[PDB]
Subunit: 182 residues, 4 copies
C-alpha cells in the first residue's frame, strides 16, 4: 500500500518521490498549479477521498515550493486566460494577508505567499467532510504543510499539522499568527 | 524549464519521473484518479493551459495503467462519495463502448476499459480550446496516449497521437477500430 | 414550501413560473446554459441536493427548449472561449447519437438534439447518488424531462420519467430507442 | 434578445422575472444556492461568458436575499454532503468579516452576511477575465449587487455597482466600509 498522499505543485523542480528518502510507491500523488485544495474541486477532492476512504492513508502532505510560477502569476497583473480563474483563489489569500505582504520587500513577498498558501490549503483540506468524518469515526489521519526550498531542501514549513479538527485550528491560527510577526 | 506535460493516474505505482527517462526539471505533472481530462474540470485544464500557453510545452502524454483502482471502482457498484461523481465520466465511456466490452470476457474488461479511457481522454484533451487554438495559430503540440503495466511495461500499442485536430480524429478512431478487433 | 425543482436553460424565452400554471414560489429553480446536469458540477448538484435532502422536494423537472442558443453553439464550429468547454458535454451526446442526427435534415437536427439532451440529462440526474439514495431510503422522488416548444407550449417531451433507478433505465432506453425510429 | 443577466438564489421566493419589471425575453437567468460567483465554477462562469461575449449583455445583477437557506446552512454546523463544499466559500466570507459579524447580535448576523455576500460575489464577478476583458476592450458593462427581502422589498442600499475595474474597487470597499458602521 501507499502510506502518504502527496498534494504538490505540477512543477518539475518539485519531484515528490525523489526529494524525500521514502520507499518507492509509498506516495499516492496529486499535483495541480500551486498545490491547491479548492472546496469545490472534484479533481483534487477525489484523490483525497480515494486516499482517505479507499486506501486508508494515514497522512496527507500538502507541499508548496519557492519560485513557484503559480504564486508569481497569481500576483502578476496579466491575463493568461483560464489559469487566472484558478489563481484568483491564491489572490484572495494574497489580499486576505495583504497587510503582512504589504510590509515585505517585493520578493520576500513571493516566498511568504508561498508559505501562507500552504497553511491556507491545509486549512481547506482540514474543513473537508472527507477528512472531518474520517476523524470522527476514529480513523488516524494527519495533515501536513511543507514548503520545498527549491534552491536547498525543505522545511516543515509551518506548525500547520492537524490530527483532528481542533488541532487544525490551533495549528493554522498559530501558523498565520507567527508569519505575521517576525 | 519543462518540455513535457504528463497527465497520469495518482496511483503510487505509476510515478511519472521513474517511468520516463527525461532530464530532471523537464516533466510537468498532473495526476488524478484514472487520469481524466473532463471538459469542465478547472484543475486539469488549468494545468494544460499553463503548459501550452505559459510554459510553451510541445508534448502532452496521458498515461493510463492496468489494474487501476479508478477503473475498477467505475465498474463496481459501490458508493464512495465524491469519487462516484468523478467516475461517472468513466462509466459513460464504459457505456459508449458497451457492445465491444460486452463481447469481452469479464476479467479482460478492466484492461480493455483502461485502454479505451486513455484514447478517450486524449480525444477530450484534443478538443480543448487550449489545444485547438495552439494548433490553430500554428504552435507545435503533439498529444500522446499510452498505457503502462506494472508487470510488463508500456503496451507496444501504435495507439494515440495527435499533432492537429484532423490527426486527432484519425488516431482516435483508428485506436477504437483496433481495440474492437477481437 | 416549494414542491418542484426546475432545472431549465438560462435563456429568457423559457420562464418557468409563467409558462406553467403552477402556484407562485412552488418552483425551486436552477438555470444554466442548455439545462445541463454534469456529473462533476457542484453548482447544479448543490441545488439538487438542497432540493432533495433539505427541502424534501418530490419532483425534479429538467426542461429544455427549442431554438436553444446552447444547442446551436454546441453544434457550431466556433470558438466562443469558455462556453465551448461546457458545451463539449452536449457535443459528446451529438456524436453519441450521430447516426440519428446524421440522417435528419440540418435543422430537425437542432430540435432533435434538444430532445435527446433532456433525456441524457435526466439520465445523469438519475445516476446521481443524491437522487439514488433518496430513492433507497424510500423518499418519493420523481424526475421528468420536458421540452418547451418556444413557438408553441411544451410537450412531456419523452417518456423520460423515473421514480426509481430501474424506471430510469426503462424510460431512458425507450426514450432513445423511440427517437432513433419514427 | 436579452439585455440583463440575473444571478440569483435558487430560492422559490426570489423569482427573477417577478421581482423585476423588464420586458419578457430580456432576462437571462442563473440561480444557484446563495447566489455565488465562485472563481472556478464552470457553470456560473459559462453563463456570464455567454452573456457578455455572445449575447453582448451590458448589465449583470447579482440578487441576494434575507432569510436565505444557503446563508443559514453556511453558518450552521450540519453535514449536507455536496452542499457543504459549496458553502465553504460562503463560510470563508463569514471568516473574512468575522470581526464585524463578531460585533453583531446573533440574530442580525444572517442578514449582515447576506449583504456582505452580494458585495463579495460582485467582487468576484468583476475580477473575472470575462468581465475584465469586456471592459479592457471598451465594451459597456455594469455590475449591480442588490439584496431582496420578502417582507420589505429591495433594501434601499447605495450598495454595489461597477462599470470598470477601478469602480469595482471603489464600490466594493465602500460597501464594506458602510456595512462596518454599527
Ligand atoms: Zn509551482
Ligand atoms: Zn489508477
Ligand atoms: Zn437555451
Ligand atoms: Zn437563498
Amino acid at each position: 500500500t501507499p502510506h502518504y498522499l502527496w498534494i504538490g505543485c505540477s512543477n518539475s523542480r518539485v519531484p515528490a518521490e525523489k526529494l524525500t528518502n521514502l520507499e518507492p510507491g509509498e506516495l499516492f500523488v496529486h499535483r495541480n498549479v500551486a498545490n491547491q485544495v479548492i472546496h469545490t474541486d472534484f479533481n483534487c477532492l477525489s484523490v483525497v477521498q480515494y486516499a482517505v476512504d479507499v486506501l486508508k492513508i494515514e497522512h496527507i502532505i500538502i507541499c508548496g515550493h519557492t519560485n513557484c510560477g503559480g504564486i508569481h502569476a497569481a500576483m502578476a497583473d496579466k491575463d493568461l486566460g483560464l489559469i487566472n480563474n484558478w489563481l484568483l483563489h491564491i489572490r484572495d489569500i494574497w489580499f486576505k494577508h495583504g497587510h503582512l505582504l504589504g510590509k515585505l520587500s517585493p520578493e520576500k513577498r513571493a516566498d511568504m505567499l508561498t508559505k501562507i498558501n500552504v497553511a491556507e490549503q491545509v486549512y481547506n483540506l482540514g474543513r473537508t467532510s472527507i477528512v472531518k468524518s474520517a476523524w470522527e469515526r476514529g480513523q488516524k489521519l494527519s495533515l501536513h504543510g511543507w514548503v520545498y526550498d527549491v534552491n536547498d531542501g525543505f522545511l516543515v514549513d509551518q506548525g500547520v499539522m492537524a490530527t483532528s479538527r481542533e488541532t487544525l485550528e490551533i495549528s493554522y491560527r498559530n501558523a498565520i499568527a507567527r508569519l505575521s510577526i517576525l
